[PDB]
Subunit: 466 residues, 4 copies
């Protein structure tokens, strides 16, 4: 065993196989990618990287699976099974690009609309590259793993499929619930990031993962074995999803963290055609195509920000000038927030068209960022997809609907938030943006912006509805 | 000279020598012997803390905020006279909590003396006059530029409210009445202290940042009266604070077992009340329930009385002592389940007494035996949203205050701001008994069209098919 | 199992037998005795009681013994053995009197010189009373304990003996090292109180118990099986004993905490002849004799402070008047601190005589408190009684002397601290005390008091040596 | 207007708009890309923090203390001019740390350019002039009542020392030179920030309370110069701080493996140094080691350069890239053991280079292969006790300062205040090799009459009987 001191979880023992996986270029890459990306430029505590998140997630994947094992030997959880879950935990974020979510969430979508690609599809490919380029496949056999079976089981824990599961049977289904839970989103990923992000952000966590594990249990639920919580834990589960939403409001969708993410993303776009990254057999790739070669994607990290800022080639004057505007803190100015009304959703189809709606300023000048906020399952209540159990009858699982819990829980479980920033920064400009934007809200029958009477005194009498 | 003290929540805090004089008196040191969460200690073993240390934090934070407004806004004319008076209100605001704090004013006195209406604050004010008077403080206030006729009023009114309705300070210094206990919307430093401190000791983490709130607080004209205001951006965090609070009540302050221990103690006190003399003003003897009428005698009434009873041997207390032993041994009245009203049924305080009778009545296939505890849960203002009573302000226009309705914030905020929780416990404890209670109770829920109890299918297999509606 | 949320250790599972032991008058008594006693009147965070200390100690006793078990199955640690250690942990402080250490350390010694008695001799008798008065002896058999053997083993874990051990063999000796370690004082008692006292005091702990357990191991050391630490942990062990000493300086021997302890102790003495406590078969006992009947000692708790203060019988005017002087904060005034020199120890024989030496003020007026400060083993280095082990040879234990560690470790491992307080409080009085006291130091060739030139300007030129 | 920022160590901290102007420059934002503990991150995975956030805390604490003295003692004449200058020194005091902070000024530059003497502070001062000059700050200082001729000196001198030896402020404002970097005894707010922050991120708890120290600090005449002083009672806590520090160096800052990673990087840089151009003032190209001579070019030199190398493909860097890959794969040079000199043998900085040769020489029954790292460990002032250079004061006489020698404190304090630690690593890694290293090294210790290595009987069974003295 090998012990390592993570400040969130303490000293954690790593099995020598997990150490072999860790000490590879593919994994040590996560030392150079920030967890909250743009957040560092707002919360100066948030220097943490995906490397240390990736270790906690592995650690907690083990905690929970040993715990179920101990509490319930009848499950036949093997040391083979425990290792596989730990490995999924470790490798589950292997595929995050530069600035984590900025890459898969803003950059790739703008830079290559033609693909569907997510840090997880990346986490799985990077995992194959890791295994293959570092002779791990042998070492797994060495500790009683069976690669044909287990690499599948690991790949499927991360992403989902590829009864839909080649890796383990319906009798070991609860193992697919640990690292990334499609049934309801209650995963140890969240547990680690809540604790860790709060630690570094300087916000306190309200959610006790240790307690949840104490009360977990595996029960039959429709000829599949799911994980279950004590009946009394249900309150705490609604709170976790609140905590999460609360983290996004305060930190992960901070109005300025987001505009920094956006400014970097634009600089990358300005640089993308002109930056070659060396891959498999010397083939040159661009920042946006590098996700198609894991040799080259290994090299793509937060470094590239500085590669750009510290550059001197004039075909990058474009992108370098943006990034200097961050160093000097000329950000694009925020104009305001608003929300749709009644039953108006906003198609991902239409995001690109929204500045045009907002326009004398040109719409090239506006940015409009549309943020979906849910409890993980779009419109659905994820607690409606959790199985609970009583002290009296510890194997008889049950359902608990919202109305057996409280009336102070939310009526809707998902909303949209629209935020307008302006790229022209002066007071003449920014006033204009503020009048356009407030009339836009009134035109679309969106909400009066919080600041709306103050920034737009002559426009909020336009709407009786305000 | 100043005096430093190390509170583990707020750190080293400087006490003005007047505040030290107030502290070092029998009336205040009394708070060392009263637990903040009372019955909570017998469920959350971390919760040894007493009102003494809460009372210091609240004073400390009362000062923090009032110095802060002062600094940020000199135009407010906040004097060292004013700052002291707020600090003193903070310190003395819980002076009147009885044994086990809330159990006393919330369960005991109501059952033991229906004839009075009385609350730890009415007590905090009387105990404050006693303190001032019995310890020659009145001189010492003049000594630091306080004016007792004016300022003892101002202090008394910060604690309770009145007695423009305020003799103590004008409409131009109204924001000072918002610090220690906020009637406008409940956003007070009392909460801030207890959140931090109760979490510390309970072993829950706090999600609410008081330090941040103070940084963005500011005083603005709102209807020709000067109120405190928050930045527009803080509004999210305020909805969260009231959630945090409600969350604390669910987890800890209304814990099903903490509550039944509170109730068992309260019954033991009732059993002992007729038979325990407490010596007051001029040797007059008072009972536990009448001691609230004499602050000399109420000074002596503390958590001690639990042990005075348990360790006694007088047989007129076999009654109460036997209850309290049943806590030591952990024969509690057994919890049966929880349920909630439906549609828009509230439950009149009129009808609480009648509820066990109802439970005995149910006919699935005595009421002296049942207890039924009705717990009202809100965001402080019964049915109202307290954020709808907060004034915010923009970065652009820092004096122009504004309102922010729920709809400008989120759709994931609560639809209702107050609910009821009904809990049935049974005083007969065995397996034959407790099964019965579980059948009665579940048919009762079905009869009243209340919610299926979460555990309802498991404890009452043959009765939750009675309701199609479940 | 039964879970309970201690804020120091988290949610901890209690075996149903341990719950039965806990839910008794003898144990719930610890809810009404403060851990740091007089400390509460200086550190207002320090409301904590021995009840919750007593649970942590049990919890940690289990942690460590499960851990050795897991790491080393060859030890034959049984569930019988684990329970017994947990029970010792739980019951090890059962015998603390009112204000914990004030009782066994100041009161009983002054009030009954004729006995030798310590909270542990009490912890063992109170344990027999608990077992006997609550039908536990049956319930132990029920979970495979063997009372004749195991109550001995428990009693011996707490106190020591009664190869000197009837409870377990030389092959299970490492179990006697967990709750109270005579070999070197490295016990989980310390671990719990460091963490807990710091939590409540508002001082931070510097010592990581979790890490120590990760590196513990059992090795042969002279045909007895001792617990051993990794070689690298040795630094951290010297630090723990420092942390401890550091806690005593700041908090446990605070000049004012101590004088409050002393004032209470005097009030008790004033009240002792006149307070009857009801024991076995109605026999009446005094506060000082109550340690001779566990029925009556069950009733003796911090309550007695208030029983006195709130009393009205005039044969207690004496003691009640003292306790009011604490409420009002008329403490006896502190005069100063000093230390012996060369090789002058101060016999416990001579403590009573010291005020006489200090004396116009009478010596009835002075108090002189002599505090011994060590690393647990009087003059000895306790690390010189710890066995370590290398990564290379995990069973070959070894010794590590101070000079293989550092030159910044202490030259001596024990010292004395003498503190003079005066019971007459005014400025005329207290000046006098300050001149007496400083001449006293010069007469005994003790150290110049830190404040000595300032409080005694005309006396510190008396000594050339200063 | 003020600007608030949430540092997780100190909370929400208000930044004066001048400080914000200084912060939002290439020279300062550079500190976002330099890790505080450098190689430490590859052992303590929590230690992602950078000098940027340390640099903010140090500024924050520089202000705390100087406002505090001001409040407590108006007679000192501390102006808003003075407070700003100290805050700015705090902010800019680490501006000159190179890549991996201490690895750069402590290992790299010394090996790479013997010809210069240079330290992150000489760099912090030059980078400060560059910042001021390249970003029109000089105007903005006049704007808030600073006087650049005087104040840029005062700032430069707070950071480094001189250039009564101080042009920036008189002997009557000498206590201001004690805040950010204390030559008198090392008791600075730099330490306070790094203790709290490094512990936070390392996963160690701090034992040292800076908040308390500030509460009891006070300025007194000491030899017709005004120094800072501590209460008499604080002295215990000061010995503990210097212990805490030494304790941090043992556990973390000199961790046997963190150090060898620092060394491996340093060798990779050396391998790359001749072959990497960094563009400075007027297009002039500079090497990693010469970049410290041009602040335009040194602005660009950050931790980036590690990855610039690792991700490169130019074959003149096969050298350095191959080393850095050996870190990614965790082929470190293997650690062999630790030992210490004996009696009163120091080890001249003269002789460090010669030590591998000695280890190859030992004849138990090549030196290009060994590395030998000599680590000096003190309480900041080589052989001196820094408490012997602190002025204390009594409650009775708050202006009369005094000395407190070790003997008035304890006998459990350290006999010596500085020691040496010698560590041998071997660059050849296999079992045949590493055994050999372990025999050479243990005979070496016995030859020099150094201490038996703790692991010495186990790694060298046939050699620790060579010494009777063990
Ligand atoms: O007045 C108090 N009432 C309390 O309820 C109290 N609880 C804790 N403390 C702390 O105890 C220290 C020493 O006590 P204290 O200062 O009264 O004794 P002392 O020997 O220092 O005498 P002096 O400083 O008054 O001359 C003080 O600095 C306080 O922080 C209290 N002080
Ligand atoms: N005293 C300490 N307290 C807390 N954490 C520590 C301490 N010393 C080291 N660590 C951290 C750094 C690492 O993340 C982890 C393991 O460090 P360490 O015990 O130094 O292992 P190592 O691999 O260097 O030892 P070994 O010689 O056993 O291989 O713990
Ligand atoms: N070393 C310490 N670290 C943290 N808190 C401490 C320490 N020592 C004492 N305290 C706490 C306990 C009290 O609540 C508060 C005051 O203690 P202390 O400074 O010793 O006051 P005191 O009244 O004894 O000093 P004085 O000599 O001023 O009378 O700080
Ligand atoms: N939500 C919570 N978060 C943290 N601690 C909690 C929470 N709820 C309760 N606790 C504490 C109080 C107790 O010390 C311990 C156990 O409480 P709880 O789960 O309420 O057990 P219980 O015995 O009342 O449940 P059961 O019905 O299973 O018997 O945990
Ligand atoms: N809800 C929160 N809780 C704690 N810290 C927060 C929260 N929101 C933001 N922060 C942190 C991040 C920053 O470091 C600092 C400032 O954030 P914020 O108040 O949102 O500044 P801002 O510059 O966006 O406001 P403004 O509208 O004044 O420009 O506080
Ligand atoms: Fe993740
Ligand atoms: Fe209160
Ligand atoms: Fe103990
Ligand atoms: Fe620094
Ligand atoms: Mg190792
Ligand atoms: Mg997920
Ligand atoms: Mg004092
Ligand atoms: Mg209130
Ligand atoms: Mg229970
Ligand atoms: Mg011990
Ligand atoms: Mg801003
Ligand atoms: Mg320094
Ligand atoms: Mn992921
Ligand atoms: Mn109140
Ligand atoms: Mn003990
Ligand atoms: Mn520096």
């Amino acid at each position: 065993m090998k012990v390592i001191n993570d400040p969130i979880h303490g000293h954690i023992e790593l099995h020598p196989l997990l150490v072999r996986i860790i000490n590879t270029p593919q994994f040590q890459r996560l030392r150079y990618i920030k967890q909250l990306g743009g957040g560092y430029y707002v919360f100066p505590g948030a220097s943490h990287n995906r490397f240390e998140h990736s270790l906690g997630v592995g650690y907690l994947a083990g905690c929970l699976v040993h715990a179920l094992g101990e509490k319930q030997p009848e499950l036949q959880i093997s040391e083979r099974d425990v290792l596989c879950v730990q490995i999924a935990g470790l490798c589950h974020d292997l595929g995050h690009g530069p600035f984590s979510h900025m890459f898969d969430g803003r950059f790739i979508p703008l830079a290559r609309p033609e693909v569907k690609w997510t840090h997880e599809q990346g986490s799985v490919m990077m995992f194959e590259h890791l295994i293959n380029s570092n002779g791990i496949k042998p070492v797994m056999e060495q500790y009683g793993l069976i690669p044909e079976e287990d690499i599948c089981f690991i790949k499927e824990q991360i992403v989902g499929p590829l009864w839909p599961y080649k890796g383990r049977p319906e009798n070991k289904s609860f193992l697919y619930e640990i690292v990334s839970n499609k049934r309801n989103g209650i995963d140890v990923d969240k547990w680690d990031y809540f604790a860790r992000d709060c630690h570094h952000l300087g916000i306190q966590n309200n959610f006790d993962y240790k307690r949840f594990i104490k009360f977990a249990r595996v029960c039959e639920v429709d000829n599949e074995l799911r994980i279950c919580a004590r009946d009394k834990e249900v309150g705490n589960l609604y709170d976790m999803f609140h905590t999460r939403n609360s983290l996004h409001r305060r930190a992960y969708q901070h109005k300025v963290g987001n505009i920094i993410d956006t400014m970097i993303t634009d600089a990358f776009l300005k640089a993308d055609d002109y930056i070659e990254i060396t891959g498999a057999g010397g083939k040159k790739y661009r920042i946006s195509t590098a996700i198609d070669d894991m040799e080259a994607y290994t090299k793509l990290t937060d470094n590239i920000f500085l590669e750009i800022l510290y550059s001197t080639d004039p075909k990058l004057k474009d992108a370098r000038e943006i990034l200097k505007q961050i160093e000097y803190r000329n950000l694009f100015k925020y104009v305001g927030e608003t929300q749709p009304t009644g039953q108006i959703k906003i198609k991902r189809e239409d995001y690109e068209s929204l500045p045009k709606e907002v326009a004398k300023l040109k719409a090239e000048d506006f940015i409009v960022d549309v943020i979906n906020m849910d409890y993980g399952m779009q419109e659905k209540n994820p607690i409606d997809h959790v199985s609970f159990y009583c002290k009296t009858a510890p194997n008889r699982a049950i359902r608990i609907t919202k109305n057996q819990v409280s009336q102070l829980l939310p009526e809707k479980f998902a909303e949209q938030l629209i935020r307008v920033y302006c790229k022209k920064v002066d007071r003449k400009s920014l006033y204009a943006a503020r009048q356009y934007f407030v009339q836009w809200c009134a035109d679309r029958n969106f909400t009066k912006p919080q600041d709306g009477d103050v920034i737009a005194p002559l426009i909020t009498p336009q709407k009786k509805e305000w």
